């Protein structure tokens, strides 16, 4: 099981950063075109975070979309929040990774901001 050229392989996944700047949704859609089950990167452990940091350093100050976003509000009874009388608007953000003291940290960003982005897909 060989990751395509330019992608970096962990045991189970192929990863690749792309420099071309895109909104969160068009980055996600770009990742999904790359492969079966392709998405913006998810980070499931410290070891994956460290591996992803290496992927970034091999390829590249960076600011890149991850697959992490905020959910819609949902009432405790399970209903969607359609109507609201919120004092301040709830606006779902998405998360970029940026360098912070030699590792990286995840920061909220406007989903319509154009950024570099990171794709992941499962081998097989």
């Amino acid at each position: 099981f060989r990751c395509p050229t330019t992608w970096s392989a962990s045991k189970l996944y192929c990863y690749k950063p792309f420099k071309e700047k895109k909104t969160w949704i068009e980055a996600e859609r770009f990742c999904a075109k790359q492969a079966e089950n392709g998405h913006l990167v998810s980070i499931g452990s410290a070891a994956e975070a460290d591996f992803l940091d290496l992927v970034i350093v091999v390829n590249f100050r960076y600011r890149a979309w991850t697959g992490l976003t905020e959910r819609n509000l949902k009432w405790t009874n399970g209903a969607s929040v359609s109507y609201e009388n919120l004092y301040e608007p709830y606006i779902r953000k998405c998360f970029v990774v940026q360098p912070w003291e030699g590792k990286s940290k995840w920061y909220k960003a406007d989903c319509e901001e154009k950024n570099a982005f990171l794709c992941k897909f499962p081998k097989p």
Binding site: L40, S45, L68, E70, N77, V81, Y83, N85, K105
Partner: protein
């Protein structure tokens, strides 16, 4: 029919409670009603107005601050966070601190807006459930 002590509309039953609780205690209390209930939700303006009128009818037309059935937090698998590939939130490395915000309606004058608050505040609340 709605049980005794509950206000009814066509399909829903509502009940204000004066005993102040944290947001989690309040929601838990609602879920433990003989008919499982939840903290009040409002799906349109008229329902919000109704809920406010029931509260006012129960609190002597005074100012109040009542929990409602919304909470957001950024830690663990019940967060308001999700991965586009559907994997669980099993690891986080947020710049922002871990936090939780619980929503309430604060009646000052007129229909209350819904504000965020410390989940450990002790507030009055309302339960709601749907008739069969």
């Amino acid at each position: 029919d709605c049980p005794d002590g509950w206000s009814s509309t066509k399909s829903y039953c509502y009940r204000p409670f004066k005993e102040k609780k944290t947001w989690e205690e309040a929601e838990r209390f609602c879920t433990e009603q003989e008919k499982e209930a939840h903290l009040v939700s409002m799906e349109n303006r008229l329902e919000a107005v109704f809920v406010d009128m029931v509260m006012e009818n129960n609190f002597e037309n005074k100012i109040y601050r009542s929990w409602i059935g919304l909470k957001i937090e950024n830690k663990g698998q019940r967060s308001n966070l999700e991965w586009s590939d559907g994997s669980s939130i099993s690891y986080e490395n947020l710049y922002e601190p871990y936090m939780e915000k619980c929503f309430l309606m604060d009646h000052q004058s007129g229909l209350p807006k819904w504000h965020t608050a410390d989940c450990e505040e002790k507030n009055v609340f309302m339960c709601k459930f749907q008739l069969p």
